[PDB]
Amino acid sequence: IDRLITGRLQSLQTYVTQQLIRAAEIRASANLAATKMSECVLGQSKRVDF
Amino acid sequence: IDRLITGRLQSLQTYVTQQLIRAAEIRASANLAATKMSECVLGQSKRVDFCGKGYHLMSFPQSAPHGVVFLHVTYVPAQEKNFTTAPAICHDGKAHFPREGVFVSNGTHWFVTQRNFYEPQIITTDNTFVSGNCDVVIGIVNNTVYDP
Amino acid sequence: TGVLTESNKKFLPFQQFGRDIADTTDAVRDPQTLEILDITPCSFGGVSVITPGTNTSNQVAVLYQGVNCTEVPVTGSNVFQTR
Amino acid sequence: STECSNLLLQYGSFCTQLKRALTGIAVEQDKNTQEVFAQVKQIYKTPPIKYFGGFNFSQILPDPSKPSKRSFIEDLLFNKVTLADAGFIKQYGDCLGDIAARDLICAQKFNGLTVLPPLLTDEMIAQYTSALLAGTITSGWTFGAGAALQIPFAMQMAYRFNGIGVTQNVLYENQKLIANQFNSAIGKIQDSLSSTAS
Amino acid sequence: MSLGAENSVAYSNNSIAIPTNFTISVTTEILPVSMTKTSVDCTMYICGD
Ligand SMILES: *[C@@H]1O[C@H](CO)[C@@H](O[C@@H]2O[C@H](CO)[C@@H](O)[C@H](O)[C@H]2NC(C)=O)[C@H](O)[C@H]1NC(C)=O
Ligand SMILES: *[C@@H]1O[C@H](CO)[C@@H](O[C@@H]2O[C@H](CO)[C@@H](O)[C@H](O)[C@H]2NC(C)=O)[C@H](O)[C@H]1NC(C)=O
Ligand SMILES: *[C@@H]1O[C@H](CO)[C@@H](O[C@@H]2O[C@H](CO)[C@@H](O)[C@H](O)[C@H]2NC(C)=O)[C@H](O)[C@H]1NC(C)=O
Ligand SMILES: *[C@@H]1O[C@H](CO)[C@@H](O)[C@H](O)[C@H]1NC(C)=O
Ligand SMILES: *[C@@H]1O[C@H](CO)[C@@H](O)[C@H](O)[C@H]1NC(C)=O
Ligand SMILES: *[C@@H]1O[C@H](CO)[C@@H](O)[C@H](O)[C@H]1NC(C)=O
Ligand SMILES: *[C@@H]1O[C@H](CO)[C@@H](O)[C@H](O)[C@H]1NC(C)=O
Ligand SMILES: *[C@@H]1O[C@H](CO)[C@@H](O)[C@H](O)[C@H]1NC(C)=O
Numbered sequence: 251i252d253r254l255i256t257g258r259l260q261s262l263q264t265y266v267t268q269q270l271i272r273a274a275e276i277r278a279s280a281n282l283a284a285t286k287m288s289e290c291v292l293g294q295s296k297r298v299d300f
Numbered sequence: 301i302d303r304l305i306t307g308r309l310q311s312l313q314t315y316v317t318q319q320l321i322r323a324a325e326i327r328a329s330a331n332l333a334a335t336k337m338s339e340c341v342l343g344q345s346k347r348v349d350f351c352g353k354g355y356h357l358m359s360f361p362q363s364a365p366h367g368v369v370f371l372h373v374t375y376v377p378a379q380e381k382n383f384t385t386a387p388a389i390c391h392d393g394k395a396h397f398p399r400e401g402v403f404v405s406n407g408t409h410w411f412v413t414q415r416n417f418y419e420p421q422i423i424t425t426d427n428t429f430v431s432g433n434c435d436v437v438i439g440i441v442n443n444t445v446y447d448p
Numbered sequence: 449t450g451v452l453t454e455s456n457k458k459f460l461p462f463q464q465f466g467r468d469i470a471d472t473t474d475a476v477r478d479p480q481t482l483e484i485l486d487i488t489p490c491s492f493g494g495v496s497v498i499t500p501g502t503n504t505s506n507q508v509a510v511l512y513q514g515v516n517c518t519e520v521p522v523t524g525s526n527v528f529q530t531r
Numbered sequence: 532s533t534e535c536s537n538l539l540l541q542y543g544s545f546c547t548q549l550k551r552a553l554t555g556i557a558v559e560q561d562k563n564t565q566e567v568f569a570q571v572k573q574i575y576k577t578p579p580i581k582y583f584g585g586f587n588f589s590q591i592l593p594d595p596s597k598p599s600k601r602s603f604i605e606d607l608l609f610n611k612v613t614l615a616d617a618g619f620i621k622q623y624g625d626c627l628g629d630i631a632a633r634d635l636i637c638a639q640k641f642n643g644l645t646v647l648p649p650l651l652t653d654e655m656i657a658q659y660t661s662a663l664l665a666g667t668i669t670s671g672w673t674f675g676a677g678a679a680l681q682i683p684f685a686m687q688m689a690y691r692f693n694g695i696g697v698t699q700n701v702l703y704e705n706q707k708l709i710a711n712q713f714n715s716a717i718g719k720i721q722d723s724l725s726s727t728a729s
Numbered sequence: 730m731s732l733g734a735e736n737s738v739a740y741s742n743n744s745i746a747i748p749t750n751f752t753i754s755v756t757t758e759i760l761p762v763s764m765t766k767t768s769v770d771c772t773m774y775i776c777g778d
Pocket of ligand 4: 380382
């Protein structure tokens with residue numbers, strides 16, 4: 251039971267670490283989307299390729 | 301001792317991984333703060349909703365424990381009024397468009413003003429330009445244009 | 449531990465067990481009467497406690513997550529059904 | 532299993548910080564959605580007249596016939612992404628049904644994994660999108676800097692043309708051509724969304 | 730939840746709204762920059778002398 255507990259705990263920790271990295275990437279994309287909503291829809295942008 | 305060593309090593313590696321992820325987030329926030337210091341404080345920003353809400357005028361930095369506080373000074377229009385608008389003015393078979401501003405009417409007379417503040421002025425050839433004739437622009441109205 | 453229900457699984461005559469993706473038994477063959485029984489885990493879910501501050505009030509509300517409002521037992525008379 | 536729980540209690544507080552990390556991610560997702568979409572303070576609406584200088588916004592404005600007030604392009608985008616239901620509407624009720632085809636979501640729920648519903652429903656995201664579109668169409672950029680100030684759409688497009696560096700007589704003498712080009716571009720967006728799946 | 734107050738701006742094809750006054754607004758934006766710097770000794774944490 252101790253062997254099974256150690257293995258399942260390692261699997262759960264790996265899943266949560268990958269979820270944290272993916273959440274950081276998703277938060278960066280959401281910040282970019284909020285900036286594009288503020289500067290593209292609510293006004294006119296002079297920035298090239300923005 | 302090997303069991304305790306494995307447990308404490310796993311706990312320490314978990315702490316270090318969480319600290320690295322938080323360091324990445326804090327570095328992103330610090331890069332945003334550096335960009336806001338370079339653009340809001342050291343200049344005037346035309347980006348909408350960057351450097352405060354409204355038309356940005358000034359910004360002031362203040363230090364804070366583990367951070368920075370920006371005082372954003374912005375311009376907000378306050379008291380709007382209704383006016384009758386038109387895209388151009390027909391005069392002598394010529395279409396006049398405003399240089400800067402917008403044609404407004406208060407019911408009887410037509411003036412030209414600026415867009416962000418109500419300061420009406422007499423429509424003159426100095427503040428208008430001529431392009432084309434009157435049967436192209438949709439919504440053109442008839443008025444005289446003053447010549448000094 | 450679980451709930452045993454009658455099944456319509458097409459067990460072959462040499463098959464006595466049925467397994468899942470996570471390597472757990474989903475169906476069993478009863479040894480006395482040759483019948484197929486589905487096994488499901490009993491009802492469960494998460495419990496969340498909604499409160500104001502303890503300097504404001506000691507009243508709480510309980511949210512049972514992912515389970516219908518007719519299965520939670522085996523103010524507080526104001527039962528509401530959210531998603 | 533009580534014996535496994537009594538042995539798992541000796542491993543400290545790994546589970547509590549695991550739950551704390553997952554809870555922080557769950558709060559951060561709702562914060563992301565709120566900081567993207569909830570950017571307008573008042574829910575604007577389009578006037579019942581549907582003339583905007585010849586520009587046709589029938590595909591981006593909401594359709595009141597459907598129970599979910601979504602536009603045509605929003606319906607195409609929602610139909611193209613094959614989003615799973617993710618155990619929202621009472622997954623334990625559906626997993627109790629006597630079906631021989633066992634789902635993966637039932638195994639996920641029975642093994643302790645749960646998916647929480649988002650705070651903002653799709654109707655509220657559609658309402659925020661509709662308010663942003665109504666404010667942009669009927670006021671320009673003024674509604675993002677205070678109160679919404681009405682302006683005809685031809686004068687607004689002349690302001691945009693002056694913003695990019697073109698004189699407004701280019702718009703006013705080519706208004707129908709620009710409206711037709713915009714309508715053809717919207718129709719091409721229709722056809723590319725209906726055809727291309729990548 | 731309430732998304733906001735319902736509004737309906739009076740749009741027509743010959744009417745404009747122009748402000749006649751203004752306000753000067755000062756707002757506050759708070760941003761983190763750095764956090765606490767920490768150091769860990771393994772030989773004293775895991776074993777302790
Ligand atoms: C529209 O504005 C003009 C501004 O010149 C008004 O003209 C003047 O109105 C005042 C009264 O408010 C008179 O005393 C002046 O003699 C007018 N000047 C003229 C006629 O040259 C005009 O009355 C305004 N119209 C409306 C409907 O308010
Ligand atoms: C604005 O565009 C819409 C397209 O979404 C036009 O509506 C369609 O018109 C065609 C005729 O060419 C019909 O076959 C479709 O059934 C219409 N779709 C609808 C009503 O949902 C609409 O006519 C355009 N408005 C104009 C040209 O004023
Ligand atoms: C523009 O708004 C300002 C306030 O923001 C007005 O100033 C006020 O005017 C009244 C009447 O003259 C005074 O009693 C107040 O003390 C003023 N407030 C100040 C100075 O902060 C101003 O009159 C408005 N102007 C117009 C043209 O409407
Ligand atoms: C302008 O006219 C509309 C409709 O006639 C009215 O609702 C509004 O109060 C008026 N004033 C302003 C400042 O918009
Ligand atoms: C402007 O004047 C011309 C002739 O000077 C006339 O043909 C035209 O109808 C007038 N426009 C309006 C809107 O009355
Ligand atoms: C065992 O039980 C089954 C069904 O109850 C029955 O058919 C069978 O004859 C029994 N065997 C003996 C040895 O009693
Ligand atoms: C679950 O709840 C809904 C509405 O609250 C109800 O219609 C449905 O019958 C319930 N399911 C049961 C009791 O199995
Ligand atoms: C301008 O608006 C009025 C009323 O809102 C409408 O009758 C008229 O047709 C519009 N002009 C054009 C060119 O559609």
